[PDB]
Swiss-Prot record, chain A:
GO cellular component: cytoplasm; cytosol; cytosolic large ribosomal subunit
Organism this protein belongs to: Escherichia coli (strain K12)
Subunit structure: Part of the 50S ribosomal subunit. Forms a cluster with proteins L14 and L19. In pull-down experiments interacts with CedA.
Record-level Gene Ontology MF annotations: rRNA binding; structural constituent of ribosome
Protein name from the UniProt record: Large ribosomal subunit protein uL3
From Swiss-Prot, chain B:
Pfam families, per the entry: Ribosomal_L36
Source organism (scientific name): Escherichia coli (strain K12)
Listed GO MF terms: rRNA binding; structural constituent of ribosome
Keywords of the record: Ribonucleoprotein, Ribosomal protein, RNA-binding, rRNA-binding
Protein name according to UniProt: Large ribosomal subunit protein bL36A
GO process terms (BP): cytoplasmic translation; translation
Coiled coil: none
From Swiss-Prot, chain C:
Complexes and interactors: Part of the 50S ribosomal subunit.
Function statement: This protein binds directly to at least 2 domains of the 23S ribosomal RNA, thus is important in its secondary structure. It is located near the subunit interface in the base of the L7/L12 stalk, and near the tRNA binding site of the peptidyltransferase center.
InterPro entries: Ribosomal_uL6-like, Ribosomal_uL6-like_a/b-dom_sf, Ribosomal_uL6_a/b-dom, Ribosomal_uL6_bac-type, Ribosomal_uL6_CS
Modified residues annotated as N6-acetyllysine in this record: K43
Similarity section: Belongs to the universal ribosomal protein uL6 family.
SUPFAM superfamilies: Ribosomal protein L6
Annotated source species: Escherichia coli (strain K12)
Pfam family, one: Ribosomal_L6
Chloroplast among keywords: no
GO molecular function terms listed in the Swiss-Prot or TrEMBL record: large ribosomal subunit rRNA binding; structural constituent of ribosome
Name by which UniProt lists this protein: Large ribosomal subunit protein uL6
From Swiss-Prot, chain D:
Keywords of this entry: Ribonucleoprotein, Ribosomal protein
GO cellular component: cytoplasm; cytosol; cytosolic large ribosomal subunit; ribosome
Pfam families: Ribosomal_L13 (PF00572)
Identification of the protein by name: Large ribosomal subunit protein uL13
Entry keyword Ribosomal protein: yes
Similarity comment: family membership: Belongs to the universal ribosomal protein uL13 family.
GO biological process: cytoplasmic translation; negative regulation of translation
Its job: This protein is one of the early assembly proteins of the 50S ribosomal subunit, although it is not seen to bind rRNA by itself. It is important during the early stages of 50S assembly.
PANTHER family: LARGE RIBOSOMAL SUBUNIT PROTEIN UL13M, RIBOSOMAL PROTEIN L13
Complex and partners: Part of the 50S ribosomal subunit.
Entry GO MF terms: large ribosomal subunit rRNA binding; mRNA 5'-UTR binding; mRNA binding; structural constituent of ribosome; zinc ion binding
Species in which this protein is naturally found: Escherichia coli (strain K12)
Amino acid sequence: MIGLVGKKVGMTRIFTEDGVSIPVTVIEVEANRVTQVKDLANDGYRAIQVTTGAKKANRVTKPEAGHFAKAGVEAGRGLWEFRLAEGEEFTVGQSISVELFADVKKVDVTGTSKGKGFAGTVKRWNFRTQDATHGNSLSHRVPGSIGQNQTPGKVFKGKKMAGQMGNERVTVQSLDVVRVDAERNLLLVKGAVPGATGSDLIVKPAVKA
Amino acid sequence: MKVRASVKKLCRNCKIVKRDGVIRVICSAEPKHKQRQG
Amino acid sequence: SRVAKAPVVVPAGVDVKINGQVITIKGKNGELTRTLNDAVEVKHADNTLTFGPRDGYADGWAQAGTARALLNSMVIGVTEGFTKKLQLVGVGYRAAVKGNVINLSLGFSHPVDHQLPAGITAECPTQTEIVLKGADKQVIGQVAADLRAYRRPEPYKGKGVRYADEVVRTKEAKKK
Amino acid sequence: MKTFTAKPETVKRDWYVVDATGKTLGRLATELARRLRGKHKAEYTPHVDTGDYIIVLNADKVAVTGNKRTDKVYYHHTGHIGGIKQATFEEMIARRPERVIEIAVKGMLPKGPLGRAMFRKLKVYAGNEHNHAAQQPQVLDI
RNA sequence: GUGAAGAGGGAAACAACCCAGACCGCCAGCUAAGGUCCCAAAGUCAUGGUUAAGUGGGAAACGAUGUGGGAAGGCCCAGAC
RNA sequence: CGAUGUCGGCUCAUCACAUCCUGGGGCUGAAGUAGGUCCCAAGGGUAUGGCUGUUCGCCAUUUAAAGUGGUACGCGAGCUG
RNA sequence: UGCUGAAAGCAUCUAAGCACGAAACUUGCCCCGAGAUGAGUUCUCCCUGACCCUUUAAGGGUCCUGAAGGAACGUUGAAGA
């Protein structure tokens, strides 16, 4: 399933006559250019190569510019090859936008997680702290639940440590479509989207039945 | 049902049958006496 | 190992054609069966059959004692086939045939809606009788054993799919 | 005089192929390992390479004795908490038939990397053909 | 009796148990226990019987027409399961 | 004997199955709703307070389970006294 | 849960021959992942050079000419000890 690459902006409310204000996450679409169209020549597969919107491209390298010359005359953002499924997906006719959401009402959104620095355990991993009461000092928030006794000898991922977390691929599947307008190029969903304003938000309709 | 650990040949309508490595009780007159293993 | 001695006997309505391991048999049940004598060898005498062991295959008369039954079951299979014995009990319960798809209503959320194997027909002469049609004695018994397994017969109600048999598994009530 | 001490400049490479039709896995894998080690060419040294390159023509044509398709459990583990991962010939042969002999020789070859030095000379294929017609592998018998 | 104060080959392990006693060198051979599938060297050993349990290579009551070989007993060619 | 600091608690799980809740099959003196209760299985799931150092035992109130157990009878270069 | 069926006329899910199926599980989804040394694929971009010496089938020197690109050095941040 092709992703539409919507970018993060913010949340709004939209109301109904029963006074319910209906908070919804906002995404404004610009859609794909389509820049290769692969069919059969490499490993029998079909793939679109989408390219999103436009960019200033003020310092691009020749390895990028020689590809922009065969893609068109205006330089887009990203790449995303997007492999197509047999009898399920097509590249033929007009290129597609928000008609992906005309009857499918659950979606998935890939993005990039925020940087947690030290990360730790008692916030990120739902662990309890030690209390500063009863004359207790020196170890209140310091991790140390790592063994017994000599029996463990090797460590599994149910044990948690400090170290850099964030700045990698993260995906959410909690989102429900509340309003779509193809003439306003607008998608409104219930629930929140990961990471920072701008970014990418790859956004595609759900494949779970 | 039960398995217990041993089987008896208590009536004439019971014959006791070994199928696919296991011995079992079946009685067409009384399902109360179904038993596995022996 | 006594049954490999048997003459088997065949009706006039079968011509019994043979070439090496391949036996070709046909009759008025719409079937043209090609069955194999690969591990054992059979000899025909126009009305009777004799089986025996092959070179490089199992010794004695045991694997031959099975081969007679399968050939008899196919001589029957191509001439007239096998008779009905599967039944349904319960009011509003219904068996139905939708081409290669079968239906069985048992008071539940969906009517089975299952699709038949290769080489078998289903028929319902009344909504509580189930007949399976073909030439293979196995598929017409295997599909009945897969069909009877849906919800299984109820103890006091007696309801569900049953066989014609003098034994009773329906239970009677007790005083409290 | 001393017995033959091998120099690393002695090394030689030739290509072979063997048909798997109806053959029992262990009676093929043991014969394969003996030719893989180079016992027809060079011996009396683990200090120098002795092996020759050999193709198993079609892995889907292999068999096992009696009921042994259900035999063995192929246990392995390293971590991700407890639980031993198990396999069966009946689950390999319909997925990738090349796999059943790729695992078989691993107890027949010596030690650690000394057996791996011969495992680099092994090829297995499925589908009645291979990719090495330019190496001209010579046919083995029987 | 060995070991305590006796090394070596074997029982992959194992003072002692098995075998056998230690000067040193062998571009030697014959024997001991033990081994002869394969890491791992020497029988993919031969002959006959046993055997579906991977038992062999951890385990009892009991049960099944488990199953090889036998004799005595009943049922029996005028006739038996 | 040139020191594997003493009981329970908190933190923290993790393995077993003679399975507690979940599933699969069944007999019932199971007509139905409940109940009694035995094979098969380790994917997912199994309570807090009072006096009391006490976990526990007793009690109060709650469960789908508050299951029966192993972990130096799981707790100090981790804590309280 | 099993069908057709022998060895053991019958009987049998098994011997020859072939089916159903669990909250479990492989693919499917979501994320990682070719040091997968078995290191796979494909597209976009670039460079079209000589000489001296020697105990040299190899080293030590000099000059022409350095692409595509990368980094330092900066102004710092959605990234950070």
